[PDB]
């Protein structure tokens, strides 16, 4: 009752981690469709409160929700009060569900809108250089353009199939 590769049980006969058995792909494909349908129905029936989203904007990622403010570190060529859509949404989350892009969510699924509320400049930033014993000293002050955005709304549509 011993197979060719049988090893008696010792501390090193088998690996320390437990054995993992993943679900049958055919059975899991059906379970996945059920989960997606359940979450889609929650969207149709409006069973969610406040939403948040992770949006890629101006090279960096922002976790935002309705009424939030974000300080963009450059000018955007938009008048104050102009409303725009943030098109790069990596994630949208609710109390009971979260949708993840691969890497970006489809534009049909989620719509994030924002409004320019201020265009200003940063406070003065000192740039000082110094090297001892070399009569080497310089001083430069820079102010960087900035734009303040208000996140107006995060809306999701029942487009999960």
């Amino acid at each position: 009752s011993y197979l060719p590769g049988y090893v008696p049980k010792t501390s090193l006969s088998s690996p320390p981690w437990p054995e993992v058995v993943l679900p049958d792909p055919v059975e899991e494909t059906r379970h996945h469709a059920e989960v997606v349908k359940k979450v889609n129905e929650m969207i149709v029936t409006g069973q969610y409160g406040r939403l948040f989203a992770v949006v890629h904007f101006a090279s960096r990622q922002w976790k935002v929700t309705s009424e939030d403010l974000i300080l963009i570190g450059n000018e955007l060529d938009l008048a104050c009060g102009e409303r725009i859509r943030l098109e790069k949404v990596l994630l949208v989350g609710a109390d009971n569900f979260t949708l993840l892009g691969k890497p970006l969510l489809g534009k049909d699924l989620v719509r994030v809108e924002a409004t320019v509320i201020e265009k200003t400049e940063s406070w003065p930033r000192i740039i000082m250089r110094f090297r001892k014993r070399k009569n080497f000293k310089k001083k430069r002050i820079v102010t960087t353009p900035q734009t303040v955005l208000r996140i107006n709304s995060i809306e999701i549509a029942p487009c999960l199939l």
């Binding site: 590769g5 090893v7 008696p8 010792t10 090193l12």
Partner: protein
């Protein structure tokens, strides 16, 4: 196995020997081509000092090792088990294989220090009073280099020097 019994009756002593029950190797080893008990059961590189179920098969009732000619082990495996048994004794994993004490001997109370993976005998090691620089540090050996080829399930190899 064989027992030797001395029975002294009056002025006459009688030394005899009897054959007791002998254990047999389990049937159908997974690797019949194997040349010693270890590789016949695909156990090479897959046992440690705490595998007393394995180690206890190759030792005498009082904790001593059995000859390699009797067990059939190869030199390499025989040496690994020998070191593993020493570590098992020192770790306290063989409480029923203690040395024989002559009648009237009761060891004095000695301080109990839990230890494992003990390469050397405690009394033969000196304190490391001078550790030395980082580039010539005196290290504290842990485990045995004989087990360096044991199967490693981690990405880090066994550290034998602490």
């Amino acid at each position: 196995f064989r027992e030797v019994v001395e029975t002294q009756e009056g002025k006459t002593t009688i030394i005899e020997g009897r054959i007791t029950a002998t254990p047999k190797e389990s049937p159908n080893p997974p690797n019949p081509s194997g040349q010693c008990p270890i590789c016949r059961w695909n156990l090479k590189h897959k046992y440690n000092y705490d595998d007393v179920l394995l180690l206890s098969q190759f030792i005498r009732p009082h904790g001593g090792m059995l000859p390699r000619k009797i067990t059939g082990l190869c030199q390499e495996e025989h040496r690994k088990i020998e070191e593993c048994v020493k570590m098992a004794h020192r770790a306290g994993l063989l409480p029923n294989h203690r040395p024989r004490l002559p009648e009237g001997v009761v060891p004095k109370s000695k301080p109990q220090l839990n230890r494992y993976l003990t390469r050397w005998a405690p009394g033969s090691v000196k304190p490391i009073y001078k550790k030395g620089p980082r580039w010539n540090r005196v290290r504290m050996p842990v485990g045995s280099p004989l087990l360096r080829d044991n199967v490693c399930y981690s990405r880090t190899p066994w550290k034998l020097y602490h």
